A and B are shown apart, each in its own frame.
Chain A
């Protein structure tokens, strides 16, 4: 009856930046998914490939828990087949995604008077991310034709930008904590059943 450590992902004090999104591999445990999908504390609980009520009646080899922080108007980008700054440059889901996307407003935790600026996002990139690709590089973005040589300047930008989270912001600009659960099925042990 080894219980899956979902409280470590969902109740962590800190959350990662979206450009450096966190991933926790859940394995060799029993998961009670009804704990999560029957909770009214989630504004978004969207599943793809699977149905929520059937999650307890299912088994997978591994389950991955991706978590990060974005602002409210960007939660729609955490879904298969979306475009935008977050989906293209920070966190991309595959079109054949199998899993669930969970998000909830965290204005009470991640916003601060004067502004919280710990959470960052990637503003520029030469090309889109492939699904589940992670880019944590900090190379100066060359928007023109003169090489930057690692120097910020004209047409030469630092690729990361900080979120500004004040508690008085509108809902669309407020911080939201997101958890993406991926269910993997290889020709393999299938160690995570979870009645």
Chain B
């Protein structure tokens, strides 16, 4: 009875029971998300509870198979994921306190209101609508400081205790702290030179930031000059951007600054929604077009049970539904897409995005249950986003008859498009890096409690080039005012998945022998590109993510140079546009100073 065979026998018993309990949990959850009734909440809770109860019990049996003694790395990975106790390593009382803490912060976030000089706005949609659309300095300031002084202040004492119990949980799971526990998602232990330590993620993420800083500084300088036009009495040409003028409640994306920053305001964006309606497209036509695109690159078509079981429109009966687009991998070769699709270019691109998740789910469906996931937390969205990249290009829209055969995209709308992309993609990278770096150092104890707000805004000025419009002491908890922080979600997933998606695109575009700028690339009708991609998709998480990445792009390394190549036409445009502007920022200046 060798160690490999005992644990494989255990995994065989686990897999045969997990597939049923996980399916019943997914099916009940599906029946709620597509039929919102009080009856189906309880079924979803009971089905979810018996699946959670089962996994907890199997996780404790699984810990008796020491990883060191297993020769089989495929077996070793399965036991590893199953052995990860998480919050179950805490005492039952301490896990219940943390659950109460996490449920109170989440409740405070979604019920928080801000009352002006009785009528109060929630975040959704009141305070949001102001932060994404208002061009008035003082109205955005009232919403920005109001959200952080009413909601964030409530979260300050709860988040302090949230850190204690999370670090205690991670220490019980034999990690440095909660931050080092999160970085374990990128830990590869495999063959020679595919190794990836949790501490190496810190150096990669920091190194990638230094390579990005020049492009970000030029986008930052261009946005600063354009904001100086609209807020002439509040903006400094060499200072950080006021945190409340960035296009949303936190400045995560700069997308909503496009009306203030569009390089050529008379050039409209290419919107093919009218062409879709003019041709009597409906939601079945949309997902049929998405299916043909994946078949064009050599990926399989949808199963018949996909078309029967999916919810591709908002139901025409009276049942209430969650309309947020999701791709469901329920198990047992049951793949579905839940989507309240409308006949628009936006939902046309979303259909390719969600079906990209489906292709990924179908590819690794023959893997053992515990290995059916992305290589790491950033692979699934990276794969889904490159499909909408190809489908959104005018070349592809012309080839499916949605753009006129005459159509020629001029340079101005090409620059308009790249600028719009950079507000979302490039603008969010320093924000994402600095946020998770602050959480990593708060969990590690490098940032003491009495300097949380001091360090948060010292790193905002330093890394993001963003300054607070109002001085905040330690009664505030400003990061907690973001959904992902208040709801206990790791954030570096948005950093890495952005790096991955442009490595994938550049690799697949070279395989398709595309010629021209990378942003005009359409991988349609290239079977070798989809075949190259599938060699990674079918791996699941059965191999080190570095090896899975190398099977597509040829490199074991998370590389940002592909993203820089994608935005090189814009960087060339920005350096000329910023010729009379200051590139960089000083961390000293404050709008309140």
Do B6 and A171 touch across chains, with their CB atoms under 8 A apart? no
Contact B61 A123 (CB under 8 A): no
A155 interface residue (CB < 8 Å to B): yes
**Contact indicator per residue, chain A 58-86, by CB within 8 Å of chain B (1) or not (0):** 00000000000000000000000000000
Interface locus among A26-34, A127-135, A160-168: A160-168
Number of A residues near B (Cβ < 8 Å) is: 20
Q: Are A143 and B333 in contact (CB under 8 A)?
A: no
Name the contact of B6 in the complex, choosing from A115, A155, A168, A169 (C-beta under 8 A).
A155
How far is it, in angstroms, between the C-alpha of A146 and the C-alpha of B6 when the chains are bound? Answer: 12
Q: Say whether A124 faces chain B, with CB atoms less than 8 Å apart.
A: yes
A164-B20, A169-B333 given as contacts; is B13 within 8 A of A145 (CB)?
no
Query: Which residues of chain B are near A145, meaning CB under 8 Å?
Result: 1
Per-residue B-contact encoding for A152-177, CB less than 8 Å = 1, 0 else: 00110100010010101111110000
Q: Is the CB of B332 within 8 A of A170?
A: yes
Q: Which of A143, A155, A171 contacts B305 (CB 8 A)?
A: A171
Cβ-neighbour of B23 out of A143, A161, A164 (below 8 A): A164
**Chain B positions within 8 Å of A172 at CB level:** 332-333
Give the complex CA separation of A87 and B13 in angstroms: 18
Contact A170 B305 (CB under 8 A): yes
Residue of B nearest to A72 (CB): B333
A161 engages B16 (CB within 8 Å)? yes
Interface residue? B390 (CB, 8 A): no
Complexed CA–CA distance, A172 and B333 (Å): 7
Complex interface: chain B residues within 8 A of A7 (CB): none
Q: CA of A144 to CA of B9 in the docked complex: distance in angstroms?
A: 9
Choose among B20, B303, B309, B334 the residue that contacts A115 (Cβ–Cβ < 8 A).
B20
Main secondary structure of the interface of B (DSSP, over half): helix
With A155-B9, A164-B19 as known contacts, state yes or no: A170 contacts B333, CB within 8 Å. yes
Give the shortest distance, in Å, between B41 (CB) and chain A (any CB).
Answer: 18
The verdict on B64 contacting chain A, using a C-beta distance below 8 Å, is yes
B interface residues, how many (CB within 8 angstroms): 23
List B253-291 residues whose CB lies under 8 Å from chain A: none
Nearest chain B CB to A117 CB, angstrom units:
8
> In the complex, what's the smallest C-beta–C-beta distance from B12 to chain A, in angstroms?
7
Closest chain B residue, CB of each to CB of A145: B1
Task: For B332, list chain A residues within 8 Å (CB).
Answer: 164, 166, 169-170, 172-173
With contact pairs A155-B6, A170-B334, A173-B332 given, residues A123 and B13 touching in the complex (Cβ less than 8 Å): yes
- Docked pose: A114 CA to B21 CA in angstroms: 11
User: Does A169 contact B16, Cβ atoms closer than 8 Å?
Assistant: no
Partner of B333, one of A114, A115, A171: A171
Asked if B27 lies at the interface with its beta carbon under 8 angstroms from chain A, I say yes
12 additional A-B residue pairs with CB within 8 Å, beyond A114-B24, A115-B20, A124-B9 = A123-B13, A124-B12, A143-B5, A143-B10, A145-B1, A164-B332, A166-B332, A168-B27, A170-B333, A171-B305, A172-B333, A173-B332
Residues of B whose CB lies within 8 Å of any CB of A are 1, 5-6, 9-10, 12-13, 16-17, 19-20, 23-24, 27, 61, 64, 303-305, 309, 332-334
Sampled A-B contacts (22; CB under 8 Å): A114-B24, A123-B13, A124-B9, A143-B5, A143-B6, A143-B9, A144-B1, A145-B1, A154-B64, A155-B1, A157-B9, A161-B17, A164-B20, A168-B27, A169-B333, A170-B305, A170-B333, A171-B303, A171-B304, A171-B305, A172-B332, A173-B333
